[PDB]
Amino acid sequence: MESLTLQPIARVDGTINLPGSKSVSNRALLLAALAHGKTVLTNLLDSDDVRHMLNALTALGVSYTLSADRTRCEIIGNGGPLHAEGALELFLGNAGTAMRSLAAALCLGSNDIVLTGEPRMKERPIGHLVDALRLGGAKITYLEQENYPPLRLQGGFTGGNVDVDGSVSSQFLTALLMTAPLAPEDTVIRIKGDLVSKPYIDITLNLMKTFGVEIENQHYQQFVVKGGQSYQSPGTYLVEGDASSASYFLAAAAIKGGTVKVTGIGRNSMQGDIRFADVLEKMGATICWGDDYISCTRGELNAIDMDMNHIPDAAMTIATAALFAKGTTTLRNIYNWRVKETDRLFAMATELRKVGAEVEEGHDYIRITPPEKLNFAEIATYNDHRMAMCFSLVALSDTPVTILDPKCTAKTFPDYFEQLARISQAA
Numbered sequence: 001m002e003s004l005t006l007q008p009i010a011r012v013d014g015t016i017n018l019p020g021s022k023s024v025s026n027r028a029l030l031l032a033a034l035a036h037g038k039t040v041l042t043n044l045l046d047s048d049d050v051r052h053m054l055n056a057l058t059a060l061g062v063s064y065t066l067s068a069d070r071t072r073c074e075i076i077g078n079g080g081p082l083h084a085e086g087a088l089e090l091f092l093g094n095a096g097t098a099m100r101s102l103a104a105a106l107c108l109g110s111n112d113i114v115l116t117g118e119p120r121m122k123e124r125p126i127g128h129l130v131d132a133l134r135l136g137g138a139k140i141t142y143l144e145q146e147n148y149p150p151l152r153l154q155g156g157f158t159g160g161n162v163d164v165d166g167s168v169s170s171q172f173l174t175a176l177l178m179t180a181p182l183a184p185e186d187t188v189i190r191i192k193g194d195l196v197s198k199p200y201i202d203i204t205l206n207l208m209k210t211f212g213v214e215i216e217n218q219h220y221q222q223f224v225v226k227g228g229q230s231y232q233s234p235g236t237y238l239v240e241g242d243a244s245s246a247s248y249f250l251a252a253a254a255i256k257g258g259t260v261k262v263t264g265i266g267r268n269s270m271q272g273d274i275r276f277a278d279v280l281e282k283m284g285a286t287i288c289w290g291d292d293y294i295s296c297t298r299g300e301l302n303a304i305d306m307d308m309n310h311i312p313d314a315a316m317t318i319a320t321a322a323l324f325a326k327g328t329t330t331l332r333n334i335y336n337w338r339v340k341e342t343d344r345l346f347a348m349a350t351e352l353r354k355v356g357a358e359v360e361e362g363h364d365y366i367r368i369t370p371p372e373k374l375n376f377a378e379i380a381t382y383n384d385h386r387m388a389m390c391f392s393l394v395a396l397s398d399t400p401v402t403i404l405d406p407k408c409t410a411k412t413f414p415d416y417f418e419q420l421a422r423i424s425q426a427a
């Protein structure tokens with residue numbers, strides 16, 4: 001078991017140029033692969049989740065080149081649905097953005113492809129998406145546990161009236177939205193009830209428009225899509241910096257700054273996680289917005305009680321920042337933390353208690369009462385990049401912290417610790 005120990009950080013201050021957005025990166029790669037023409041993506045994220053998408057495109061026969069640092073990608077569009085036969089197996093790690101989107105996209109036309117991944121991915125639900133794709137005509141077989149990957153996709157999605165449950169993941173709807181335009185018939189996607197992680201749907205529609213396709217969004221309850229469309233290369237496209245990755249650095253300033261500025265995202269960003277800055281402001285920090293930056297300056301830090309359904313990923317950062325806030329913090333409406341890289345409600349409550357907090361692990365919320373002083377702990381990370389990054393913040397105190405399996409940050413941010421060190425100051 002590898003581990004790293006972080007020494008106490010007296011103050012943070014500086015500027016971080018963000019790694020590319022994982023969410024934008026994987027959508028842009030799939031759309032570029034489906035489109036006609038050559039797309040040049042810049043500021044693409046180099047991380048496990050994107051690498052699995054790149055490897056999948058390679059296996060499907062898509063041609064592309066990568067720059068030395070893997071952040072510039074020149075993709076030769078396929079000019080239509082991707083294809084492979086012979087039950088070709090695509091390994092997708094634990095990348096939901098790739099598993100869900102490809103599960104839908106590869107249902108176009110005929111194909112015989114198997115999508116699989118790491119053990120945890122075989123425990124992450126996908127039944128809501130499979131149910132919808134089947135209503136649209138797709139043939140899909142669960143090779144192991146019903147409602148979970150691995151899936152054998154044999155094609156047939158033609159369109160029509162499709163219902164989809166949006167209560168567990170917005171990724172199912174996102175997958176359907178990117179796929180439907182290329183189906184032969186028109187598609188009407190009806191949301192069954194609640195829709196979680198709504199801002200990610202806006203990211204999807206934004207990317208689709210960039211690639212030449214628009215649809216009719218009827219108050220996020222029903223989406224009307226015309227079939228027979230084609231995606232078109234946007235030429236050169238700049239991938240936004242990752243707003244979720246930015247959360248750690250902005251929170252670090254709110255706790256121990258100083259002023260920390262992140263570049264690559266700004267007031268015009270399409271990512272819902274830029275709203276994380278709003279939460280820090282509500283807690284007492286000062287936020288500055290620019291065209292291509294967001295900065296946070298230390299003010300004070302007070303506990304909050306908020307519904308975090310709109311920023312589920314960045315919300316984890318508030319759970320450890322809460323260790324430094326005055327009062328008890330409550331994060332609500334975050335049930336799907338349970339079905340992601342690990343069951344995050346169980347994991348965050350367990351590790352937070354190890355450093356001294358009193359924590360109520362609710363079914364779909366977490367209540368955190370900070371200790372008068374933190375203690376040292378060896379933090380388990382559950383193969384979850386964000387557990388490692390969130391707990392790195394414990395070092396902005398008088399105690400060091402040991403993080404197990406620090407390389408798990410590579411899912412979305414391989415260089416995380418060196419970047420945190422960049423803004424860590426001794427004086």
Ligand SMILES: O=C(O)C1=C[C@@H](OP(=O)(O)O)[C@@H](O)[C@H](O)C1
Nearest residue numbers: 023097168169170171197200313
């Ligand atoms: O579509 C996307 O890019 C994502 C949507 C979210 O998932 P859910 O919709 O399941 O909350 C988020 O947690 C994930 O990291 C990325």
Ligand SMILES: O=C(O)C[NH2+]CP(=O)(O)O
Nearest residue numbers: 094095096097313340386
């Ligand atoms: O990035 C996160 O915090 C959660 N990601 C879930 P996935 O992208 O694997 O579906």
